[PDB]
Amino acid sequence: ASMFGKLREKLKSFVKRVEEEVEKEEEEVEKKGLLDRILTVEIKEKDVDKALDELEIDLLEADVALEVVDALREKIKQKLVGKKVRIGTDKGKIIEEAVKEAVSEILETSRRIDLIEEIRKAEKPYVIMFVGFNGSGKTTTIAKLANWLKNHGFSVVIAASDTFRAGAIEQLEEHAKRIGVKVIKHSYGADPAAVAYDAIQHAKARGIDVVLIDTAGRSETNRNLMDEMKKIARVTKPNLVIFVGDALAGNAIVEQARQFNEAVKIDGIILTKLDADARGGAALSISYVIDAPILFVGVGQGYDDLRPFEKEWFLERIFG
Amino acid sequence: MFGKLREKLKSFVKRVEEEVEKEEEEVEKKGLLDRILTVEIKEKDVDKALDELEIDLLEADVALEVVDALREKIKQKLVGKKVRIGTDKGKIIEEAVKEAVSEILETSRRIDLIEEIRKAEKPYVIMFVGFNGSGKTTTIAKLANWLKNHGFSVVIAASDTFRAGAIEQLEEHAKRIGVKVIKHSYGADPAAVAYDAIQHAKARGIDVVLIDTAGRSETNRNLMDEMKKIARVTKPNLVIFVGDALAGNAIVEQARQFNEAVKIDGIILTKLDADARGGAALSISYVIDAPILFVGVGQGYDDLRPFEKEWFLERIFG
Amino acid sequence: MFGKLREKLKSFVKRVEEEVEKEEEEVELTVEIKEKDVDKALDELEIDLLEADVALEVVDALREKIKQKLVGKKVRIGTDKGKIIEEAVKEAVSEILETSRRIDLIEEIRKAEKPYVIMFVGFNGSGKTTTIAKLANWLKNHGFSVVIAASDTFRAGAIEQLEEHAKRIGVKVIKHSYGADPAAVAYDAIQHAKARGIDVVLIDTAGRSETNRNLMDEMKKIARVTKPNLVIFVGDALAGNAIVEQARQFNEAVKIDGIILTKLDADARGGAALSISYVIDAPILFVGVGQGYDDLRPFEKEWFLERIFG
Amino acid sequence: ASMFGKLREKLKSFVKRVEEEVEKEEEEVEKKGLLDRILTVEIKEKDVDKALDELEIDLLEADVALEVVDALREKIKQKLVGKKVRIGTDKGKIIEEAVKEAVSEILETSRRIDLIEEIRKAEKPYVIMFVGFNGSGKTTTIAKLANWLKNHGFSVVIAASDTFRAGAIEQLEEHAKRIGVKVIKHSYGADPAAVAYDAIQHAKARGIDVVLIDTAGRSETNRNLMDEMKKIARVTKPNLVIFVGDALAGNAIVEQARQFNEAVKIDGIILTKLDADARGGAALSISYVIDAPILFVGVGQGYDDLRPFEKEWFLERIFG
Amino acid sequence: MFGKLREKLKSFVKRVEEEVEKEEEEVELTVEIKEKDVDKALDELEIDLLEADVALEVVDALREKIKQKLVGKKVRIGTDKGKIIEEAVKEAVSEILETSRRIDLIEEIRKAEKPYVIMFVGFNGSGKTTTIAKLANWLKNHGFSVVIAASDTFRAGAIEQLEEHAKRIGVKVIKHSYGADPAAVAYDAIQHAKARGIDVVLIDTAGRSETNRNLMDEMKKIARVTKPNLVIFVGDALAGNAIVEQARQFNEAVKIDGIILTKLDADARGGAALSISYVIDAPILFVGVGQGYDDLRPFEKEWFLERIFG
Amino acid sequence: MFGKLREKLKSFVKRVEEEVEKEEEEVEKKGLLDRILTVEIKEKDVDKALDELEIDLLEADVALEVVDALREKIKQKLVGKKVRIGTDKGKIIEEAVKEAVSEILETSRRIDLIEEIRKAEKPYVIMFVGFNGSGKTTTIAKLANWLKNHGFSVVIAASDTFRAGAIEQLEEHAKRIGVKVIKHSYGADPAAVAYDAIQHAKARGIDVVLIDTAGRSETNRNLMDEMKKIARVTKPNLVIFVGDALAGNAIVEQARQFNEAVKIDGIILTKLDADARGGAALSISYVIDAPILFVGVGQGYDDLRPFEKEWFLERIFG
């Protein structure tokens, strides 16, 4: 549980800095003998500004996207400046509350997504396309989501559209064998869209609820991964596009999502290896940047270690 | 040769046949054979088969754009069509497919090379684009020969300036057929060399200028930007994309890339005689909306042959 | 130096001179230069210029100017045609070097609310790191306080070199740990300058992409964070087959305000140096003509023209 | 503790196969009515040979070096063939005992090394050179060994001869700061041997017991990592050369050690991330191939998670 | 086909013929070829052969043989010099193709305790995978049972292709999971062949290093595990600037017993094909002269010589 | 220029001085100044300083072999040496260092180029080895000029067959000084071209053949094997390694690699005038046991200058 340790440390450091400025403000009032007229201080811009400048530095070093750093700064500044604190109250809690609110607001996307609700109301099959670079944990995630879907009453078939990774496909089939879901695949190096469109036809004929599409995570010979993704999305017309990312790649995940998003619009996000994320700045940033909710998080190597995302659990982890 | 594509078009016909058969058996059931002599193909008859054809065609390297256009050209040529109960549906259905494929090979311009040249103010400038290993260099030698045998004078610009090997090869074949090669020093500016060739052609009253271009980015780097610069400077009458037909997994995407930089007027496919798949070759004209002008069906100078849509269709449908 | 450029401009002038003489000797009070006198020479000039790394855009603008100055120009018989033609050409070249805004660095710093923030862009090997040290020295010698941000965070070597030079000339370098966020370091440096009333902050930036993401995006991020007063492209004049394309690329991401060309003194072709300002629409501010600190010289259009013609 | 799971599974499978052949042999005796004359069976070659052929296949797939596969086969064959088993005894235990012995014999190197004993008897400083490719965990290991050495009464200095990795050096110094040991370093890209020779001079003058040399784990521009290692070894004349390897790189660790060994002779081995090794074939093979004992193993991310190697703990892990 | 080789051998013959005629016409019962008659032509032959991909070792051996056959040779006046010289040259070339042991494959299989194990070595693109299928077909057509080990474990594509061809010709392929240990697969295949009384096991191997370790080491490991009856190098005849070096490399790790050259029919230079057997000291066993199964032909020295001379 | 090396040799002298001073102060203590006029340098006086010099020299790019040889040549030139109490030790100590450095520059053969050529049976064949960017090509042009100005006829073989750029450059400079360049087509066999050059020289009675060689592996590939093949075929009288002196982190290791393939007889260092470090330049002759023959101290033809050990020592010790 050194989880989000670096983010937590920088937010903690900000709170302390401001707290100490507020404390000087109180002592000034006490010293000047103003206690016969005033028992509160009003947080001023000079109490926060340097602390805000250093938070910008610290958060950028902690992998927080610039956009999110700016949104956080202004929310906090707006919540604090002019805020009245009575001498002898816990100023730390008042300051931390503003930060916590700002962070919580950062986690809001213009759409929450109830996966089960979305599938139930939809004309079957409900088609989910996965995007992401190799190493993100896409393949395992798809098996785990299949398991979760099945455990919730839905039938599922998987399209192996990662056609050039015979290893990944073999893995995919072993897991799918173990959970009783079918994998549709063609020959090595097959056309990814044909494979997926095939899995869709299979789903229609056998009345399967959900089609999950495993995709490639690198470009093969002359044609962009992004182009291939657009072609799969044109052919399969997904109900939902999920971006998969490795929480440990703090230096790349937001940018990876940005690249995919420009090609095929992301509806939802899944973060793997989150339990091992000792930093947290990227994970905190991604929903905001892509304006898409995090649907699931990987917190272990077991099938039940793919958990639906809960905002409050995430905040608990950041703040303690 | 095109066997794969032909295998797939063949099985689609078979599947539609089986559905039409059930349509007839259905008429049989209601004991209406005594008064109804025809059934009309319904969408329910072609639908699953069309989905299967989409799969099959994508796996055979047919571009998405073309697969979608084919589905609709066919789906609409069959649905509502009346067929005679008891006859062989095979001819009829295959006919519609054959038509759809034929329309797919229609581009918005046809190009009569000799006619375009004669009417044009000399020199007529032709720019070739394409990646290396598609036989661009040899193609340019062959096309030069062809133009001469039709009475045009020709000069070639060696604007593939970083490939000394290719340039040597080019001068050989050019000396062999009595055509001049204009070249500068190693690593010269491609546009400068081609512009130079053009001034020479004006001065000496040459009919045709062929610009041999690079087929890879140099260190500087970008191939597409280099092609843009050459087109800007030389203002080509005609831009021809050269591609190796055996590269079914690439050739269409190659053309798309060049097309975005400099608009392609015509296509030449090499090694087409050896193409036993044909999805890409079938796709390229539609995707780029440019006619295939010649095809390479051998290693002889006279194996670069004017493209005929009809020969192409025959090869497909056997 | 600019030898190749000079040789081809000279042949063009002599080529037209012949046609003009050959028209003075067609009369026999004035002779008029005609289109037929400049065309073939212009076309050959185009070939020659392209071979000397002159950007096409610049080649075309030169054609246009030379043509509008010469065609229809009437000159007295007996006069020196070669010199009149060359003067036209020289005017054309001089206009090519004229940018939509000359820039007085010192004036811009003084009239600006401190700190004046300069962001450098360019690829590695362009002399960026050394150039920043020299510019810092120059700025100090005109009585400005200076601080340098080591935002080239993945090159421990270049940062040591920077710190050594800076120490010599009494300039502080701000740096974080290895591979730090470049925008964070620059922002930090700016907060310091504010706190210390420093006049100038120089931002040293990466010159390659990391196992990470586009150099171009990184530059945009830095620019957003620091809101530079001035953005300066650094380029190596010997890279005639590259620098103009380099600057186009950068200019696309973050608008360039001025150019510094290094190793200019060794440039014996010059087409690229002649082109770069016109193409990016930014003045050349300093040129590097040696390895000494005083070898980063403020740029003079005149000096450049003299090197080109004679 | 899916630790060494794949190796364990293949050895288990071998035991079962032979056990079933022995069981048929017993039933044959019982069936033929020979119980009035014989109450034991003698394991024959035909009882083991196919099982031995499949063990060779299985062990090669489990990353066991060929050399070790051959040694294991012959030891087992020799222990089993002609072995007398009384009907009604536990044949499984008898067969497993032979396998366990063979495996244990495989772990014997012509030298065990008592590190503390070696340092105490030596003219100070005792110089240890580390070799290994990047990603092996060399740098962290050196800090941890420094800690262990210090906790055992020895003073320690570290040479930063990994001169081109400013990141790794910074890490190295943070850890060394935390445990109170000095790091000697020069400028970026400095000569690795000069740095190490410098740390040795420092050690002589201040009477430090141990010098640890952090080395590069990749070739820089034109000159082989192996050449650089030979040059460091010529200059520093180490008392001990330790090869560091990432237990998770089952496909490479034995070969990595082989390459280094040919250049500078390895005295001892350290395996990191062993606790996470779900295979075990390489770890089992390395001592034998290089004829060098494993001195320490990494079983966690804490400083006390670098543990002295014990053969019996290793066998316990393999067999259960 | 072998055109380049033919052209240069022919010019050498004609060059010496002149010197010999020019010596018949110096007498006037016999004329003796002298060193001064062959030297300059030999030196020019050396240049020409090196340019046609003939290995230096082979060029030198040819010099030696041609020289020992011609110098001091006395020929009757009136005789055809060109033909006598050419016969010498032809003998030299023929000896170059003679290896320290011709090999009768069928005989070796029959007289050997089954299974006879063949291990193939070579780099990707040499036609190894296709060649193994064709060799399997050939072996079956002579009444041997065959099984193939898919030890090229990191190429899912090539293994599918293999399995397709093999299925056509009634041959089983043994394979494990993706990226399996190559030696393990081959050993497995051998245990099967034993169990099933199969005559021949063909081992298909990798033709590049993985994110792993040297192809050459992998080949040694496989050879140790399988103790091949025969090791066969496969090479693409069109790779004249590579194949001999390829075989040297392999031969160094695992001794090669024989060679198969593919695409031989398209080879219009031939220097490498002429060289490979002499250099590695192994016979060429089969040549690929087309895409049909019957286009893997047993190799005939005579056939090769006829293609070279006429 | 060589400032780094000079900085380090300078500080070693200073450290030995300080120790010798303590030796004298020690004599002072025992009140023996009245009868003893000299002290002899002991190993305890040079030891720590020699360890420091090892560090300093390694960091300055001095090869290990040379650092070790220097330590011993010095340690043995100083230990046991008597110095005069009260004088300046600086001259004395520096003298020993200067000597050690001088011996380090001694190779087992000296090479008089003109003399070796005159006595040899023509053509005298010289093979150049080295990696690209070390100025091999230009060096060969300059050396050609020099040979001519000393009355030798020269032909050059263009065996750098895959670099059309370099070959053009070479022909220019060669035409400029009236020397012939023998070349074949692009990508020709280097040994064939050089052998060809040699036959030409015999035929036309040329004194000297200079073989321009490749400086990188081609796709085939190996550079060293290619050099072996060329030496085997051409049987060089002399093999010269060319290296850029500014590459202090590489040049010695480059020479080692070539030396292992084909034994180097002499060395030419380019851009030496710009070398402000000098550890590598100081090291190379010893490591390879081959004399530096010429040095490049400028861009002029006459800036390729015969090497003089004495000039070199002066440059170091100022």
Numbering used by the authors:
A (entry chain B), D (entry chain B): -1 to 318
B (entry chain C), F (entry chain C): 1 to 318
C (entry chain A), E (entry chain A): 1 to 28, 37 to 318
Passage from the reporting paper:
The process is mediated by evolutionarily related signal recognition particles (SRPs) and their cognate membrane-associated receptors (SRs also called FtsYs in Bacteria and Archaea). The core proteins of SRPs and SRs are GTPases that each contain a structurally and functionally conserved NG domain where the G domain adopts a ras-like fold responsible for GTP binding and the N-domain adopts a four α-helix bundle fold. Here we describe the X-ray structures and solution conformations of FtsY, the SR from the hyper-thermophilic archaeon Pyrococcus furiosus (Pfu), in its free and GDP•magnesium-bound forms. The low resolution, solution scattering data complements our high-resolution crystallographic analysis and shows that the crystallographic structure and the average conformation adopted in solution are similar. While the overall architecture of the archeal receptor resembles its previously described bacterial homologues from the SRP/SR GTPases family, the structure of Pfu-FtsY reveals novel features: The elongated N domain lacks the N-terminal extension observed in all other bacterial FtsYs and is instead characterized by a long N-terminal helix αN1 that packs against the NG core in a different way; sequence analysis suggests that archeal receptors may cluster apart from their bacterial homologues.
